[PDB]
Amino acid sequence: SWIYPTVILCLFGFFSMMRPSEPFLIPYLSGPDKNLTSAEITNEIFPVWTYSYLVLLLPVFVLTDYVRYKPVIILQGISFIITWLLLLFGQGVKTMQVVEFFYGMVTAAEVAYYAYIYSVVSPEHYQRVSGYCRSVTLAAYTAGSVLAQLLVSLANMSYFYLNVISLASVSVAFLFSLFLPMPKKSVFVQWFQDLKECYSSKRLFYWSLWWAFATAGFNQVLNYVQILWDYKAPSQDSSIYNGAVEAIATFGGAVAAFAVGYVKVNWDLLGELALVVFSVVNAGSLFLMHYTANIWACYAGYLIFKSSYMLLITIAVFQIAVNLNVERYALVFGINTFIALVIQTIMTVIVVDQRGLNLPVSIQFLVYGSYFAVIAGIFLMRSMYIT
């Protein structure tokens, strides 16, 4: 049945995403452990990750379906070992750039991790499995997050020890990915027309267009929500109050993902209504936590936004997988993620980069909320016109 591959992939996703070093990544390599200045951290180290993510997402959707989705997952586990091995025993800027390159590899293979379970289970389970997979990742995150907090609050555990235990956690993920069942088998412009034979399936462009636009704004909000929280309440002790909140926020999203799988409600009739309702919910939450002058209301707004977006993206992924009617599961997911990454990079260059408009953090979340409201109103007007 579907139980064994789903369980193995959920174990792999949990043990590969439960990394306690994530909330304390910058403090780890901005202190005595690595002795790296913050100037090189955000200008010559982090953008390498984005460039690697784009460059390595370019071939993932091309070649994942050919290799039947397993070697790319195994490649994620291999890159997980290399990334944290270099982050453990690597000094200087040069090692960090390779670390970000391998993390871009890791995410480009996370795309294949998402596509694999649809490549191996029958379509009837495509709903249930969907939620579970997403939920697991989210769950892993919050689990790891709280673990890190505990090891800062109840163990006095150094960041190096957090990193090595995270490497051990992703080491088990590699072993679980080794045991994943293998999916069964099955003039450049011609390939493009092949895409035209895949993106015309039961208006899958609509869900894909939402994915290509909503998740870019979601990633930007994730990147800059810590900055907004620091700006709103400039407290030196807010860090413990910040990351932990993200944890529970992620947990909320997990529940939302678990909302999709567990309940048995048709989504091919409620897909448009759910999309528009939770998109206007995302817009309202983004506007709520920008305007309110209290960090608790902003925390609630962020939790609502993250949970609603996670539910929406679970629905989007399930509906794309079901309506695809072609085996190219990682091509659609890969191209959607690549287009969304391009949009996110362009809009963060326009909005945040000095070469761009360079809006302040006060107006950054206003324009994020306006962008999400525009996205919601596009589907509001389309649904009303279609009726």
Ligand X SMILES: Cc1ncc(CO)c(CO)c1O
Instruction: Give the shortest CB-190-to-ligand X separation in angstroms.
Output: 37
Instruction: Give the shortest CB-16-to-ligand X separation in angstroms.
Output: 12
Residue 350: Cβ-neighbour burial (10 angstroms; 0-12, 13-18, 19+): middle
Instruction: Give the shortest CB-94-to-ligand X separation in angstroms.
Output: 14
Please say which residue, 46 or 199, places its beta carbon nearer to ligand X: 46
Instruction: Give the shortest CB-372-to-ligand X separation in angstroms.
Output: 22
Please say which residue, 222 or 326, places its beta carbon nearer to ligand X: 222
DSSP per-residue letters across 41-55: HHHTTHHHHHHHHHH
Please say which residue, 50 or 370, places its beta carbon nearer to ligand X: 50
Interface contacts to ligand X, rule CB under 6 A? 22, 25, 46, 49, 99-100, 103
Whole-number CA gyration radius for the chain: 20
Q: Which has the closest alpha carbon to 150: 17, 20, 301? A: 20
Q: Which sign, positive or negative, has the C-alpha torsion 181, 332, 345, 146? A: negative
Please say which residue, 69 or 114, places its beta carbon nearer to ligand X: 114
DSSP letter at 187 equals -
Instruction: Give the shortest CB-217-to-ligand X separation in angstroms.
Output: 17
For the record, the structure tokens of 8 come out as 């193995």
In 169-208, which positions are buried (b, 16+ CB within 10 angstroms) versus exposed (e)? bbbbbbebbeebeebeeeeeeeeeeeeeebbeeeebebbb
Please say which residue, 80 or 278, places its beta carbon nearer to ligand X: 80
Please say which residue, 69 or 103, places its beta carbon nearer to ligand X: 103
Amino acid at 3: I
Residue with tokens 């294949």: 112
Instruction: Give the shortest CB-99-to-ligand X separation in angstroms.
Output: 5
